[PDB]
Design a protein around this ligand. Sequence first.
Ligand SMILES: O=C[C@H](O)[C@@H](O)[C@@H](O)[C@H](O)C(=O)O
Ligand SMILES: O=C[C@H](O)[C@@H](O)CC(=O)C(=O)O
Ligand SMILES: [Mg+2]
Ligand SMILES: [Mg+2]
Ligand SMILES: [Mg+2]
Ligand SMILES: [Mg+2]
Lengths: 371, 385
Amino acid sequence: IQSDWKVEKIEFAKLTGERARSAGANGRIGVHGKSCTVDIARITIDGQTGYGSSIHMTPEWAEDVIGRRLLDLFDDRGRLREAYRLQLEYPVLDWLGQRQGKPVYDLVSSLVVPCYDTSLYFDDLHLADERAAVALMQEEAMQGYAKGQRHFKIKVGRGGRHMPLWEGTKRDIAIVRGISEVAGPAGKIMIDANNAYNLNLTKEVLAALSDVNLYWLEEAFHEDEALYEDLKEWLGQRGQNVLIADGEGLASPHLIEWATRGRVDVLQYDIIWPGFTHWMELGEKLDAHGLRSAPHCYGNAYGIYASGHLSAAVRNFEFVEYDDITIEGMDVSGYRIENGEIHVPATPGFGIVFDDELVTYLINRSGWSEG
Amino acid sequence: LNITGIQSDWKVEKIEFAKLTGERARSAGANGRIGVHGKSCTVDIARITIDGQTGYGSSIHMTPEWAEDVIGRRLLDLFDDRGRLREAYRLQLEYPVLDWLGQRQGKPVYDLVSGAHLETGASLVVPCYDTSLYFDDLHLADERAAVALMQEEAMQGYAKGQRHFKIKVGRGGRHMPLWEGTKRDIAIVRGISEVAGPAGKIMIDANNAYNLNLTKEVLAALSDVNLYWLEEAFHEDEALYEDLKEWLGQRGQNVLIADGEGLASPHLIEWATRGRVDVLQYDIIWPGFTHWMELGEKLDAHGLRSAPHCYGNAYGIYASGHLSAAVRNFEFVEYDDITIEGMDVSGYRIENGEIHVPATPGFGIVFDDELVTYLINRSGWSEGH
Ligand SMILES: O=C[C@H](O)[C@@H](O)[C@@H](O)[C@H](O)C(=O)O
Ligand SMILES: O=C[C@H](O)[C@@H](O)CC(=O)C(=O)O
Ligand SMILES: [Mg+2]
Ligand SMILES: [Mg+2]
Ligand SMILES: [Mg+2]
Ligand SMILES: [Mg+2]
């Protein structure tokens, strides 16, 4: 990177699409829907462009950044400075890989990465018949299986808000078993309560699912060291191997410490916020402790492909959280799902080919430009 | 705070630190999330000497090396342009310093911080509540035996002049089977309600042991009880509290939502301004007294209520009483009956559900100079002279 290279232009557009199947409610909130959008920035440095997720960026913010040198955005250690990450880390890393003919997984390290189908929401809430609910949710897993998914995360916590407490929990249990039989003994099964349980409700559910191949338990309740210590001990005594997964949203400031003390196994900070640069630094610390990395990704299709590249820099990388989404102007065909794995194309940047012309249109129409 | 009377000649001459020890009147059992709390109590205390006079108060996050840098500074230096003790000194020295100012000016802290313009004199009497009703019944298999004991514990408080009670619930979250535990919660609350009478304000505190539907089940079951607030039903979540507030509205059930202790969501206050949470409960020591005077002005401006959390630190109780003079929507002093050695709080009294704050200078707590000196030398530290 020459001191000659500088931020010449920054453009912003919101891209829109849909996920393949509408997502229902989860433990804590209502229907998530089918409509999807991705905020993107196009950065121009040395007459060449880079593309990527961009959040927390205003026209007035990019205004102040035009003219600065690329080198000045990096550490005296080689890390994009906290001040630029959420706004530009993806457009910048994509630029570097284009200019260098390298995929980003190279710059940071064929790439094949485990992935799970995260789309199994409360899609059964209109059905009173527990059997029909199971058949509905099984058929949803199937759709995912047919597209090459082998591992599934199932939303649970129906009884927390959206259904009567005990009836909902019975329904949870029935849905998980019923999906376990679609996945087969080799399919990994995760469950996510979105905090809708408490410790004893959790224990009851876990005990009812002794048969099932439960890979991890995600957000049973808001992270609490005392509660997770108890839960880990209870699982061990029963010889029940289920990983404890947490970390998305407004996480406890002490979550990682708790994990270093064996209370949490899987950390799940979001792939966009705190993001890619953060995750590389984090993945190193967690690797050192033998802890596992599984970045949260939902509501942002771009994060899916970011996660994939990320894995090359993280030894203990668990899964790419997958949602099947088509974003107009964002060609992700370089990627393919096969037997529970996503194959990351070995092309420059993040291997996504944006429709330059459509993007220019959306910038003009509903976005903005500085430079 | 009026700081025009502070002479530039006044400097911090000495900072001394000790840990005082004591006991609460009745051992506190488990709560929704953790085990028995016990009977043993301590309070970390600092004694500051300025212009050859002393002040005493809570002090946390202070090391000898931190204090060393403060020795020699003018007291004026510790306050911002607006007569606000500066952030960097609050946790370590706010209480000792406020006590000092009161001792020197011969006024109680509530008079120093009220911002009152009218003539002073009238006594300060502040609502309080009994916070000591833990899961003291877990050894009891029979609900009746459990209800009976918890009623006895409430009446011990009533005998000492408490009228309002906060009851730990969430038994089924961890310590008891979920269904039985929740039935037990409900029976306990009704039981104490019966004993408290209809003038008695009843608060319940789940320590995050519920979920949304467990919460509604419990609240429905307690419709006839004088439920004043629901505290930490589950970890704060705007969408869940929105749902809960609407449900309570449709039912015409007027229970306030209280939250904010410990590691709070950074957006809790915002959620409260949007009407999802009514009572804010940041601790009286951390973030502390000065912080609370600013916060309380903010909450008052939104018609929100202040109920500083105080448990695990006896000193916090008395500080909370003085803080009430500076906040319009001050709710209650959270009260635990503790005796700390060397810390004479007899100027305060509990009468008919209120703590009476003495008009004596500073925080009106008379520390045992000799004992504290003894404890400073033996196990504490000193900087300055
Ligand atoms: O350390 C604190 C205790 O565990 C807890 O039971 C109390 O702080 C309680 O939540 C309260 O409102 O006073
Ligand atoms: O935006 C976040 C949604 O409400 C959650 O369902 C996401 C989540 O828990 C996950 O993907 O693991
Ligand atoms: Mg999740
Ligand atoms: Mg969490
Ligand atoms: Mg509480
Ligand atoms: Mg809380």
